[PDB]
């Protein structure tokens, strides 16, 4: 199996003005098999270069937000996974938010972590905020 | 590796009165290997057809509860995994609860996601509530 | 693929004690490929016995906490993953805290679950608190 583990590079992000369309992008590729995965640095996309059965996972560290914190893991712009937290307006929620799932992908398909449009702050520390995949094998 | 990723059928559920024994059901079967896995949609049970080493995972999107929200991933009615949340707010508790783990299984054993009996609502959207398994290989 | 699923053996721990630097060691070794994995019962370290690509996961059940509840998954004492909850609610909080990720490892390296030192309680039940890994295959 080929793998990729992408880590945030540190520094806090406010989702509204510190990102465009909510998409996380400045990922550090500490592990990436270049024959199976390609990273797109501005669009924040993790592209698969071959058909396969893929396990996909992510985790975003919510560090303070208004009331509703959430993101989607999208595949070709389509919601596949979601991780969501809540809090009462005036109070604080520091919270790692992990989700993961398995799906069949064809070559060139692109995966991305997209924050929902809200006032939400996230910490990009490498241990709390990450994004990865495992090609478990061929697709049927 | 044979995999299965069951997605909810796009509906908000009130656990107490909309499920039987808290068991999430009416799963949509997008990707399921028919030689390893068999689905029982109304029961909500996922049956393994062959012995093996299985990674099992699940997410439930909690959308309303005032006390506790908890579920168990059960194998023949025995708890294997458990995901739990207490309230994050006095208003509306939007919160996804993911859990996963590896276990050995025998043929004809059945897995289910079983809510604890309480005043809980859930969003059964395809990207928010899901239930899957990976046959990594044989069991030793 | 070689797997390991370690489960807590029940009861609870008061994290304020800071025994063994917060490193959890209550692990029951239910499934463990002995050719790839070794558990040290006193230190709580999970040692890989061969080089390879490893998916590592953990869940800790925070049962009584008020401010920050956090833990790290460490590799040779170096943080790799982190799971964190500080939910300001006015009452005591109860959350399971799952995280996971993939990394390449050499033989003899040791993985542990290290609680950050806090006056919280964690429940060590076998269904709510666990620690595991999948050797996906050889590392490139």
Curated annotation (Swiss-Prot), chains A, B, C:
What residues of the intact protein does this structure contain?
A: 248 to 389 of 391
Glycosylation, residue list: 64, 123
Task: From the UniProt record, report the name of the gene that encodes this protein.
Answer: EDA
Q: Where in the cell is it found?
A: Secreted
The record lists its disulfide bonds as 83-97
UniProt source species: Homo sapiens
Outcome of mutating residue 85 to H, per the record?
In STHAGX1; uncertain significance; decreased interaction with EDAR for isoform 1; decreased interaction with EDA2R for isoform 3; changed downstream signaling; mildly decreased function in positive regulation of canonical NF-kappaB signal transduction
What's the reported outcome of changing residue 44 to R?
Answer: In XHED; likely pathogenic; loss of function in positive regulation of canonical NF-kappaB signal transduction
Result, substituting residue 8 to D: In XHED; mild
> Could you tell me which residue ranges the THD domain spans?
2-136
Summarizing the annotation, the consequence of altering residue 109 to H is: In XHED; likely pathogenic
The protein's name in its UniProt record: Ectodysplasin-A, secreted form
Q: What is the effect of changing residue 12 to E?
A: In STHAGX1; decreased interaction with EDAR for isoform 1; decreased interaction with EDA2R for isoform 3; changed downstream signaling
Impact noted for substituting residue 125 to R: In XHED; decreased interaction with EDAR for isoform 1; decreased interaction with EDA2R for isoform 3; changed downstream signaling
């Amino acid at each position: 199996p080929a793998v990729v583990h992408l880590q945030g590079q540190g520094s806090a992000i406010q989702v509204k003005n510190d990102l465009s369309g909510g998409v996380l992008n400045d990922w550090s590729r500490i592990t990436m098999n270049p024959k199976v995965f390609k990273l797109h640095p501005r669009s924040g996309e993790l592209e698969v270069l071959v058909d396969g059965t893929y396990f996909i996972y992510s985790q975003v560290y919510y560090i303070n937000f208004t009331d509703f914190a959430s993101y989607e893991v999208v595949v070709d712009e389509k919601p596949f996974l979601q991780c969501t937290r809540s809090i009462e307006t005036g109070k604080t929620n520091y919270n790692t938010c992990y989700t993961a799932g398995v799906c069949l992908l064809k070559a060139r398909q692109k995966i991305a972590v997209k924050m929902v449009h809200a006032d939400i702050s996230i910490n990009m520390s490498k241990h709390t905020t990450f994004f990865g995949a495992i090609r478990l094998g061929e697709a049927p």
